[PDB]
Design a protein around this ligand. Structure first.
Ligand SMILES: [Mg+2]
Ligand SMILES: [Mg+2]
Ligand SMILES: [Mg+2]
Ligand SMILES: [Mg+2]
Ligand SMILES: [Mg+2]
Ligand SMILES: [Mg+2]
Ligand SMILES: [Mg+2]
Ligand SMILES: [Mg+2]
Ligand SMILES: [Mg+2]
Ligand SMILES: [Mg+2]
Ligand SMILES: [Mg+2]
Ligand SMILES: [Mg+2]
Ligand SMILES: [Mg+2]
Ligand SMILES: [Mg+2]
Ligand SMILES: [Mg+2]
Ligand SMILES: [Mg+2]
Ligand SMILES: [Mg+2]
Ligand SMILES: [Mg+2]
Ligand SMILES: [Mg+2]
Ligand SMILES: [Mg+2]
Ligand SMILES: [Mg+2]
Ligand SMILES: [Mg+2]
Ligand SMILES: [Mg+2]
Ligand SMILES: [Mg+2]
Ligand SMILES: [Mg+2]
Ligand SMILES: [Mg+2]
Ligand SMILES: [Mg+2]
Ligand SMILES: [Mg+2]
Ligand SMILES: [Mg+2]
Ligand SMILES: [Mg+2]
Ligand SMILES: [Mg+2]
Ligand SMILES: [Mg+2]
Ligand SMILES: [Mg+2]
Ligand SMILES: [Mg+2]
Ligand SMILES: [Mg+2]
Ligand SMILES: [Mg+2]
Ligand SMILES: [Mg+2]
Ligand SMILES: [Mg+2]
Ligand SMILES: [Mg+2]
Ligand SMILES: [Mg+2]
Ligand SMILES: [Mg+2]
Ligand SMILES: [Mg+2]
Ligand SMILES: [Mg+2]
Ligand SMILES: [Mg+2]
Ligand SMILES: [Mg+2]
Ligand SMILES: [Mg+2]
Ligand SMILES: [Mg+2]
Ligand SMILES: [Mg+2]
Ligand SMILES: [Mg+2]
Ligand SMILES: [Mg+2]
Ligand SMILES: [Mg+2]
Ligand SMILES: [Mg+2]
Ligand SMILES: [Mg+2]
Ligand SMILES: [Mg+2]
Ligand SMILES: [Mg+2]
Ligand SMILES: [Mg+2]
Ligand SMILES: [Mg+2]
Ligand SMILES: [Mg+2]
Ligand SMILES: [Mg+2]
Ligand SMILES: [Mg+2]
Ligand SMILES: [Mg+2]
Ligand SMILES: [Mg+2]
Ligand SMILES: [Mg+2]
Ligand SMILES: [Mg+2]
Ligand SMILES: [Zn+2]
Ligand SMILES: [Zn+2]
Lengths: 104, 91, 245, 49
RNA sequence: UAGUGACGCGCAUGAAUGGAUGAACGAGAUUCCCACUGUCCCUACCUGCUAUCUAGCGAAACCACAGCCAAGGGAACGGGCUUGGCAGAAUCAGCGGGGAAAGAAGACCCUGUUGAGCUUGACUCUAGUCUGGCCCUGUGAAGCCUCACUUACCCGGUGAGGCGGGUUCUGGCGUCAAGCGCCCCGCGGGGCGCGACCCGCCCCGGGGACAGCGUCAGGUGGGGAGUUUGACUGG
RNA sequence: GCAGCCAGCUUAGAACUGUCGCGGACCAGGGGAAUCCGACUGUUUAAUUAAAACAAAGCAUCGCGAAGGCCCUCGGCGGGUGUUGACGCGAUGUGAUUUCUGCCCAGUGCUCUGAAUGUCAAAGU
RNA sequence: GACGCAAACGAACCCGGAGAUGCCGGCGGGUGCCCCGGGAAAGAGUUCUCUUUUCUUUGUGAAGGGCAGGGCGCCCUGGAACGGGUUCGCCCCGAGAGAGGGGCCCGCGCCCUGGAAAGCGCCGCGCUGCGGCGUCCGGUGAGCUCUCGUCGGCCCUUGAAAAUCCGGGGGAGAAGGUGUAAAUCUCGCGCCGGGCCGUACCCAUAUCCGCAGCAGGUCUCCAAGGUGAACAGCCUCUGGCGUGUUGGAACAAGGCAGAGUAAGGGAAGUCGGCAAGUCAGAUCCGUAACUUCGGGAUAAGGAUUGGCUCUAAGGGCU
RNA sequence: AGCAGUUGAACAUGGGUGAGCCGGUCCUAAGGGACGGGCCUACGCCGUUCGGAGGGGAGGGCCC
RNA sequence: UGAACUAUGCCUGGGCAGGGCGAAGCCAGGGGAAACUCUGGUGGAGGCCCGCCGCGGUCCUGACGUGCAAAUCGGUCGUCC
């Protein structure tokens, strides 16, 4: 059991000073500063509490270097709205338009 | 099961704050932390987030209600008054 | 003597409001053509908690009639409204809880909230939790309406003052007796630095006109005149009467 | 501190170059008038501010 | 002479200058009991670090001169003076009788025509505030006053977006015009009008010559400023 | 229906046993019956006072609907409360709960009138 | 179908997401550490006796690919009461369970590329750098941390903004007329650049502050073995160190400390049980007056406690 | 360097801090503080997203 | 001229062993004609308890009192979601 130290000037256990223990080829356990965990997008509806599916959960500026296929799905509102609410958006748009023809 | 005789939920306060005050918060803490039946989805999941904020965990409906209850008696009385005051306008 | 505690609150150094986590100024949608000759349809998006007040706020989403945009309004949440319902604001709005319409277009005895004191100020009266205002009478000749404020005062306002139908949500908040001094600490930690109030009799004569003496008596009549100078105007300011009543 | 500004490091560089004793040939020049550097500072007994 | 329970014409208890009560809580004040012990009877022994001695190192307070007493007298309690007792180098470790020992121009007390903090029914003022006149302050009408007028002035709203006169059946969608008419370029291209009515002098509301500003006048004003608060006297 | 194999760590019971000694060091609440005060937790005189003092929840009163209450600034009708609106803000007293909170408005003070007889400035007459 | 494919035109404007959400509790996944079994290899310690023994070493970066593992109010089929599923707790279900088959996210775990060539361990030769061999196989846990999750609890407390980045809506536009063009978010690949400033050391019983190498003060990170409930005290390993601005010799008085001990008495001491003495952990019993019914309470008062040899019960897997 | 010293954080002579990917730099938090305006005899002060003819950028080729 | 000490407020960060009492909620089993009660377990609330770090500073009116220190030291002690 060897006691390891920080590898940077920051000496406080802040949200940016987060590390993980990594074993090196020199058989040493050193600190490896981890990236903060990313979050997959939420549905633009504001109802479904779960996150979207088919999208990487990375940091915002990491999305710049990812390809477009990894940031959405092949649906209409895919990548911004969940599949459940898109079906509701289509049926609500259709049925309301039908009620506006009945009044005519 | 019957572990306390009178205090119930206010047993967390022990011997503090007085009997009549612990009895007064008891009626409120029960209704404050109560799971109410949702009038939108039918499930009994209307729990309180903050003052006047009541949210359901299934239909995701947030309702502006009372501080310690889902609806105060002053709101159902006004809602019944505004309802009949609207009926006297159309006629 | 020195400047008393009551005077130091006007300089606003440590007595300013704690407005870091507040969500904004709760006010009605500003009066436009859609609210003078009709109504505008607004959807309630979320009912949020405003730090510092016991009344929730509704994030009602409207549609701008002059540009393609969605206006987000922060209204006082009337008790009964919910996310997903449509709030209609304007002159031709129907008398439903949550709608905003002038007092002149509402029958006598209508319970309203977030009432405008003057036409256009976007709501000044009956804004705290559980409070409301009642429409007493009208006067189409002078276009003035008489309303009853939650303090029992009857104010004559214009008939164009807009208000939300219903009572402010969060009612009965003062009915729960605070038990710990810590709950009062957190109550005012979000509002301002005013909770721990030292009694003037518990001070020295230098910092309060009630302090001093080998006992903690007031020594002087606590009822003080209204024209008393700042630093002396403590106790019961211009008290018409005293006692248990 | 390891974190220095350029002005502070440039200020400490000047004081570090003035903390040198007088040259030996100076005493032969002025006739032993300046016997020692009276502005020598130590890092413990006198601070810079 | 404590504690507790009673007694109460209580020097001089008392009801939010809160009275009475009270579980729990208290490095709060107090009394008693058990247990416990060197608190004591009554002290003893042991250990470490010191003191002590030594090598090296090496201050300070303090100091008129100094340093044995008794009585005497004396500024009324000598160390020196008087009369006696007497009196022997140089030192060590202790000690706390004395040096009216040191530390500090007594902090108590009094005095000073020395202050300061603070308080009022002290003296004299003052910010603020209340009120009146004048001033910005004009206009119309009625019987100085009231009611009107808007343009002064004031307030509020707004990205100054529709002023005056002639879309409620759902937690969708709405973004620079489709269409029509007219006209100009060399079937590609362009403009204009209607759509989206006309006129207007003030952006829209709420007050309005009132608020408010300026300036004098009266009241209030320990909030604040300045100052005073005799003397004699068996302190 | 179990046989085989593997895997710990606790608990209970019993015998035997030593000088009845065994939480063997270390670690580690003396207890009881009462009175007073403050309910409690919290706070406080850095460097003599940690308390019965302060705060406290609760209770009660007072002011105020915004051309406002309270307060700041030499000053802007500038600024704080106020991103506030009486279930709020501001000013006091009392001090949990329980139980009650009597009598006195003469005095002082506050406040309300103006069928207001006096006193009564400047200006105006 | 969830959604997947290396890409997969698209402005104004709009919508949304990420940045960007507290504290506390339970549980689960993963590393690190610790622990156990190899009658495992390489050195070393002990070897009077005993000890197939004791000690040490037994490893792999980022990034990328693949796969365990974990998570999902994600989808399809379908249909539930004799209600069922299920957690430590809960919770879930005709707004659709169970079951079956899928999908997505996180994968810091394992494998691979890196990459054994390097690093460690051992042995050998040479000299004043060259070689050999090895770097193995498992077991687990109320173990301790860190981390990723999940489910809750608490608030009259709701626990940041912005830069930046992304998705969608929109269809204004752009592109060529029969093989291409416009266009390309293809870690497919190639080409070029990334300036300026800080960077040593101390960070505290001697590098800071307190006049000093001052028993004071001064914000954090890492953290082993044994005992034990313990990050308690006590002992040890790794690491550090000479006892904290001096040595030697004595062991008087009087001090300070060891909270040293003390016969018999037990507060008679003292303003006053001041002081320290008693009690103490754990298990099994037993706990009053009073009370706001919560408490009081470890009330009070008892018994037990070591060592050794056994018995019994509490699991998993095929 | 309160004894010593062959020792030192003393003295003397030299040497030493190398970055696109560690931080500053970028962002605004509380806040500070210009601008417009107002105030102030003035030095100046007030005030902070409001309040001014506060835009210096276009697409499209001289036009919105 | 000072808020590098301290007082309060604001913003953004960091931190607080192991145990104890054990409340709502939940499960199952008894008693009853019913109203409903009783028992066990689970659960883990609290300006809850013991207590380490930390933050405080009660007593000895201990040490020290030309001190280590112009306020320190020791034991004891308060609190420690
Ligand atoms: Mg405060
Ligand atoms: Mg109070
Ligand atoms: Mg108080
Ligand atoms: Mg006092
Ligand atoms: Mg007084
Ligand atoms: Mg009192
Ligand atoms: Mg009093
Ligand atoms: Mg120094
Ligand atoms: Mg006695
Ligand atoms: Mg008595
Ligand atoms: Mg009395
Ligand atoms: Mg009374
Ligand atoms: Mg009295
Ligand atoms: Mg105490
Ligand atoms: Mg003399
Ligand atoms: Mg002297
Ligand atoms: Mg003198
Ligand atoms: Mg005189
Ligand atoms: Mg004076
Ligand atoms: Mg003074
Ligand atoms: Mg005075
Ligand atoms: Mg005299
Ligand atoms: Mg009594
Ligand atoms: Mg107390
Ligand atoms: Mg009490
Ligand atoms: Mg306390
Ligand atoms: Mg003190
Ligand atoms: Mg105390
Ligand atoms: Mg008191
Ligand atoms: Mg009371
Ligand atoms: Mg009172
Ligand atoms: Mg009276
Ligand atoms: Mg498209
Ligand atoms: Mg968790
Ligand atoms: Mg698109
Ligand atoms: Mg370094
Ligand atoms: Mg030190
Ligand atoms: Mg200095
Ligand atoms: Mg251990
Ligand atoms: Mg730690
Ligand atoms: Mg330990
Ligand atoms: Mg030594
Ligand atoms: Mg030292
Ligand atoms: Mg001795
Ligand atoms: Mg002793
Ligand atoms: Mg002893
Ligand atoms: Mg004895
Ligand atoms: Mg005695
Ligand atoms: Mg005696
Ligand atoms: Mg004692
Ligand atoms: Mg007791
Ligand atoms: Mg020396
Ligand atoms: Mg040398
Ligand atoms: Mg060196
Ligand atoms: Mg040097
Ligand atoms: Mg502070
Ligand atoms: Mg304690
Ligand atoms: Mg502690
Ligand atoms: Mg401490
Ligand atoms: Mg101490
Ligand atoms: Mg004490
Ligand atoms: Mg004592
Ligand atoms: Mg002492
Ligand atoms: Mg001494
Ligand atoms: Zn959705
Ligand atoms: Zn619901």
């Amino acid at each position: 059991v060897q006691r390891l130290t920080y590898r940077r000037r920051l000496s406080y256990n802040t949200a940016s000073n987060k590390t993980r223990l990594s074993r090196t080829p020199g058989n040493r356990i050193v600190y490896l500063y981890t990236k903060k965990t990313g979050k997959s997008p939420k549905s633009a509806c504001g109802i479904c509490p779960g996150r979207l599916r088919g999208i990487r959960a990375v940091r915002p500026q990491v999305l710049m270097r990812l390809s477009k296929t990894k940031k959405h799905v092949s649906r209409a509102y895919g990548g911004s709205m969940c599949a459940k609410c898109v079906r509701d958006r289509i049926k609500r748009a259709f049925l309301i338009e039908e009620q506006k023809i009945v009044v005519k | 099961a019957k572990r306390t005789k009178k205090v119930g939920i206010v047993g967390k306060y022990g011997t503090r704050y007085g009997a009549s005050l612990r009895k007064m918060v008891k009626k409120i803490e029960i209704s404050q932390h109560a799971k109410y039946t949702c009038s939108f989805c039918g499930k009994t999941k209307m729990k309180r987030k903050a003052v006047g904020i009541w949210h359901c965990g299934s239909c995701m409906k947030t309702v502006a209600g009372g501080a310690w209850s889902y609806n105060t008696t002053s709101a159902v009385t006004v809602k019944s008054a505004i309802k009949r005051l609207k009926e006297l306008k159309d006629q | 003597g020195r400047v008393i505690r009551g005077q130091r609150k006007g300089a606003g150094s440590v007595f300013k409001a704690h407005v870091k986590h507040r969500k904004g100024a709760a006010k009605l949608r500003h009066i436009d053509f859609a609210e003078r000759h009709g109504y505008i349809k607004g959807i309630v998006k979320d009912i949020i908690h405003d730090p510092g007040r016991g009344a929730p706020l509704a994030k009602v989403m409207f549609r701008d009639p002059y540009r393609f945009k969605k206006r987000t309004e922060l209204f006082i949440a009337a008790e009964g409204i919910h996310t997903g319902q449509f709030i209609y604001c304007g002159k031709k709005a129907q008398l439903n809880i949550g709608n905003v319409l002038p007092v002149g277009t509402m029958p006598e005895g209508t319970i309203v909230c977030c009432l405008e004191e003057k036409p256009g100020d976007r709501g000044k009266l009956a804004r705290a939790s559980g409070n409301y205002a009642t429409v007493i009478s009208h006067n189409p000749e002078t276009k003035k309406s008489r309303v009853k404020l939650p303090s029992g005062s009857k104010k004559v306002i214009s008939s164009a003052n807009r208000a939300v139908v219903g009572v402010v949500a969060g009612g009965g908040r003062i009915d729960k007796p605070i038990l710990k001094a810590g709950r009062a600490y957190h109550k005012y930690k979000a509002k301002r630095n005013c909770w721990p109030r030292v009694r003037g009799v518990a001070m020295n004569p230098v910092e309060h006109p009630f302090g001093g003496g080998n006992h903690q008596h007031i020594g002087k009549p606590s009822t003080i005149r209204r024209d008393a100078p700042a630093g002396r105007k403590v106790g019961l300011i211009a008290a018409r009467r005293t006692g248990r009543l | 501190a390891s974190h220095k500004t350029f002005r502070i490091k440039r200020f400490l560089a000047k004081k570090q170059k003035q903390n040198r004793p007088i040259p030996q040939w100076i005493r032969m020049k002025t006739g032993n008038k300046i016997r020692y550097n009276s502005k020598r500072r130590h890092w413990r007994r006198t601070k810079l501010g």
